[PDB]
Design a protein around this motif. Structure first.
Motif, PDB file in Angstrom:
ATOM      1  N   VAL A   1       0.837  -1.186   0.000  1.00 59.38           N
ATOM      2  CA  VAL A   1       0.000   0.000   0.000  1.00 59.38           C
ATOM      3  C   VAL A   1       0.871   1.235   0.000  1.00 59.38           C
ATOM      4  O   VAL A   1       1.607   1.471   0.942  1.00 59.38           O
ATOM      5  CB  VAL A   1      -0.893   0.033   1.238  1.00 59.38           C
ATOM      6  CG1 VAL A   1      -1.728   1.296   1.241  1.00 59.38           C
ATOM      7  CG2 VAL A   1      -1.763  -1.214   1.275  1.00 59.38           C
ATOM      8  N   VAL A   2       0.790   2.020  -1.064  1.00 59.81           N
ATOM      9  CA  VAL A   2       1.583   3.241  -1.175  1.00 59.81           C
ATOM     10  C   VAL A   2       0.674   4.454  -1.013  1.00 59.81           C
ATOM     11  O   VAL A   2       1.066   5.480  -0.464  1.00 59.81           O
ATOM     12  CB  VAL A   2       2.258   3.337  -2.552  1.00 59.81           C
ATOM     13  CG1 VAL A   2       3.367   4.350  -2.518  1.00 59.81           C
ATOM     14  CG2 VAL A   2       2.776   1.997  -2.960  1.00 59.81           C
ATOM     15  N   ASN A   3      -0.552   4.311  -1.495  1.00 61.48           N
ATOM     16  CA  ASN A   3      -1.530   5.373  -1.449  1.00 61.48           C
ATOM     17  C   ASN A   3      -2.907   4.734  -1.361  1.00 61.48           C
ATOM     18  O   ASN A   3      -3.438   4.232  -2.354  1.00 61.48           O
ATOM     19  CB  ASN A   3      -1.435   6.201  -2.720  1.00 61.48           C
ATOM     20  CG  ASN A   3      -2.209   7.483  -2.636  1.00 61.48           C
ATOM     21  OD1 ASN A   3      -3.239   7.559  -1.982  1.00 61.48           O
ATOM     22  ND2 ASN A   3      -1.724   8.499  -3.317  1.00 61.48           N
ATOM     23  N   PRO A   4      -3.502   4.733  -0.164  1.00 62.85           N
ATOM     24  CA  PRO A   4      -4.829   4.141   0.007  1.00 62.85           C
ATOM     25  C   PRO A   4      -5.989   4.865  -0.705  1.00 62.85           C
ATOM     26  O   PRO A   4      -7.074   4.300  -0.836  1.00 62.85           O
ATOM     27  CB  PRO A   4      -4.989   4.093   1.531  1.00 62.85           C
ATOM     28  CG  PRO A   4      -4.126   5.207   2.006  1.00 62.85           C
ATOM     29  CD  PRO A   4      -2.917   5.098   1.136  1.00 62.85           C
ATOM     30  N   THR A   5      -5.774   6.092  -1.173  1.00 68.08           N
ATOM     31  CA  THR A   5      -6.843   6.813  -1.865  1.00 68.08           C
ATOM     32  C   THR A   5      -6.855   6.553  -3.372  1.00 68.08           C
ATOM     33  O   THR A   5      -7.765   6.978  -4.096  1.00 68.08           O
ATOM     34  CB  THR A   5      -6.751   8.311  -1.633  1.00 68.08           C
ATOM     35  OG1 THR A   5      -5.477   8.788  -2.081  1.00 68.08           O
ATOM     36  CG2 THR A   5      -6.942   8.617  -0.163  1.00 68.08           C
ATOM     37  N   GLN A   6      -5.816   5.884  -3.850  1.00 68.88           N
ATOM     38  CA  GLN A   6      -5.754   5.498  -5.247  1.00 68.88           C
ATOM     39  C   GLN A   6      -6.551   4.209  -5.100  1.00 68.88           C
ATOM     40  O   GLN A   6      -6.335   3.477  -4.132  1.00 68.88           O
ATOM     41  CB  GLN A   6      -4.310   5.190  -5.650  1.00 68.88           C
ATOM     42  CG  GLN A   6      -4.187   4.520  -7.006  1.00 68.88           C
ATOM     43  CD  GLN A   6      -2.797   3.945  -7.276  1.00 68.88           C
ATOM     44  OE1 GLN A   6      -1.794   4.678  -7.333  1.00 68.88           O
ATOM     45  NE2 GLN A   6      -2.735   2.622  -7.449  1.00 68.88           N
TER      46      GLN A   6
END
Lengths: 41, 334
Positions: A35-40
């Motif tokens: 997980v690098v960006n949960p909003t992507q």
């Protein structure tokens, strides 16, 4: 009875992290991810 | 006594091998796939292959063919599927293999019984001529298989398709130690050194099989679902992500699963919903699986009617983590 208690360390997963689901019986990796960006999404 | 523990370290090292490749492509994109799904699919495909196209596949999944006779491989796989399909009572876990052949197609009889026995595969006949129809037929299999999580697996579908091998896996579990909805609170997530996103952050103070592994330079938290499933989270130390990704091993995972010592900590684990759509054709090449996606590919074990090959290797996985559990689903399309 009131006795002294430790200050629990805080662990925030607010940065890139990796993980995986494992099936206990076989111990085989079901799913894996990072997980690098949960909003992507 | 059990056969699968003979291939589990292979799948596990295959999982990391494939992981690394995917991480080398982009470093700013979420990753999520199903090791198992991708592997059982190519496992049952090799059954219908021969020579260097066969060997690459088996050797690509991390099997030193000399040490382990192909016969045991498929056998341990047949068992591994068995166990995974008989989940505990509090945890549902299904996987399925499906075959889609064209109507005229005469298959090499053996092939059929081998997958129909070693991989409990289903067998279907479609008229690929009618793309839209045949396309839609295949997506309902994965849609019903994954219980609606993965629905548009195949988008395009070559007019000349001879056959299509499909695989799916569904997982839904519940945490032994749930999260209190009231606590979930919006917190910052430091994506980048300059990028910060607000993410609903779940919280809960308590006993956790957490721990800081100095070897990895990560915080390793294990979370049990009610059943036969544990979730391992790795929180790399500042600036050591890459070091964590390179140091993972199948046996390093076993350690953590054996230990159980609990400890108090105030944890904040964000609730996510991410996905992964991939065309594994290139990444598989980096791992030595190329002859199959080539004009030298030998799919003779599948049919004598014509020389075949694979045009794609499409995989899609979806993950949902909230305050009560985790439900992920994956699908492989060959």
């Amino acid at each position: 009875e009131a006795i002294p208690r430790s200050i629990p360390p805080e662990v925030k997963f607010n940065k890139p992290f990796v993980f995986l689901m494992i099936e206990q019986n076989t111990k085989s990796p079901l799913f894996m991810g990072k997980v690098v960006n949960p909003t992507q999404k | 006594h059990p056969t699968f523990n003979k291939i589990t370290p292979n799948l596990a090292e295959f999982a990391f091998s494939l992981y690394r490749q995917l991480a080398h492509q982009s470093n700013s994109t979420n990753i999520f796939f199903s090791p198992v799904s991708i592997a059982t699919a190519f496992a049952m495909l090799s059954l219908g292959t021969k020579a260097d196209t066969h060997d690459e596949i088996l050797e690509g999944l991390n099997f030193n063919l000399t040490e382990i006779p192909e016969a045991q491989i498929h056998e341990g796989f047949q068992e591994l599927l068995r166990t995974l399909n008989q989940p505990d009572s509090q945890l549902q876990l299904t996987t399925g293999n499906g075959l889609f052949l064209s109507e005229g197609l005469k298959l090499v009889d053996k092939f059929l019984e081998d997958v129909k026995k070693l991989y409990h595969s289903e067998a279907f006949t479609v008229n690929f001529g009618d793309t839209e129809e045949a396309k839609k037929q295949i997506n309902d299999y994965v849609e019903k298989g994954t219980q609606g999580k993965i629905v548009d697996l195949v988008k395009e579908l070559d007019r000349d398709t001879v056959f299509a091998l499909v695989n799916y896996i569904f997982f839904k579990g519940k945490w032994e130690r749930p999260f209190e909805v009231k606590d979930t609170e919006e917190e910052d997530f430091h994506v980048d050194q300059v990028t910060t996103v607000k993410v609903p952050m779940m919280k809960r103070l308590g006993m956790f099989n957490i721990q800081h592994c100095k070897k990895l330079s990560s915080w390793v938290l294990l979370m049990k679902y009610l059943g036969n499933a544990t979730a391992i989270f790795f929180l790399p130390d500042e600036g050591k992500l890459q070091h964590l990704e390179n140091e993972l091993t199948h046996d390093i995972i076993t350690k953590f699963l054996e230990n159980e010592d609990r400890r108090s900590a105030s944890l904040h684990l964000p609730k996510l919903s991410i996905t992964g759509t991939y065309d594994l054709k290139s990444v598989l090449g980096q791992l030595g699986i190329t002859k199959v996606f080539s004009n030298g590919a030998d799919l003779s074990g599948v049919t004598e009617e014509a020389p075949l090959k694979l045009s794609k290797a499409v995989h899609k996985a979806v993950l949902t983590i909230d305050e009560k559990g985790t439900e992920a689903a994956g699908a492989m399309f060959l």
